[PDB]
Design a protein around this ligand. Sequence first.
Ligand SMILES: COC(=O)Cc1ccc2c(c1)NC(=O)c1ccc(Nc3ccncc3)cc1N2
Length: 270
Amino acid sequence: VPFVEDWDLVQTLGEGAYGEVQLAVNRVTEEAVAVKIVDMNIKKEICINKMLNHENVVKFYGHRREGNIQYLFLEYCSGGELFDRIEPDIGMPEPDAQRFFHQLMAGVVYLHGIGITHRDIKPENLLLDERDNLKISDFGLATVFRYNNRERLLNKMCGTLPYVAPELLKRREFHAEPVDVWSCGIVLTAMLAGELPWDQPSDSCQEYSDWKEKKTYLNPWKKIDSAPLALLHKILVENPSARITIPDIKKDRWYNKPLKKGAKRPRVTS
Ligand SMILES: COC(=O)Cc1ccc2c(c1)NC(=O)c1ccc(Nc3ccncc3)cc1N2
């Protein structure tokens, strides 16, 4: 009973404009949590976080206000960022990328199902727990696109340019779901080639023009096997209304290709 509410801040997990994130350890139980410290947008992040409950979404335990400073208690992910599992210019083994992509789809399906769009999917925002289970992180740019079963079209510029869908730069209004599908396709590209295909998806970007002209003999596409590449051809489609939806990604051949063995379990012989 005494001291269970006490947490020691043992190290910095992240720093930025928002403030900082510290790894906190319970004085009594030694449970590890991530505490987001915002100097003080944050009201919306907390409200969205209160809605979330899924195995592939960073869990929100609660918040505390100490005058001006807000403390967000979040699920600690000991495996760090997916970003650091991507070898520059190489990527990672295709069965690992497939497993992470399955868990990313489960997370995004969940959020879209409750009418939430993350709006900044990228490997820095995809964390790994002790068993390498992927968790969608940081709902600071997230918003509600569906309420009372009515879709709201988005118009605000949100995200990170290499991961943003082309409609965000070309259209005044756009559907939220194809934008998250697109960023997931860029994450899959990064996992399989260890590089981003373009600085941004605009016609003034030579690499983006090459892709629309189907020059897949060029990098990063040359490093990707034909089966995951065929999926990327359906995701990285400029027209968001013609882009593949998640129910159709779940039917894709590479998505359902057996590649990955289960977690290595202890065994003996004779
Ligand atoms: C001491 O470090 C380690 O042992 C390995 C490590 C490194 C970076 C992160 C984590 C773990 N885990 C997080 O849960 C984590 C939690 C939060 C976070 N950043 C956020 C920023 C803003 N909002 C939410 C999360 C990054 C994170 N990455």
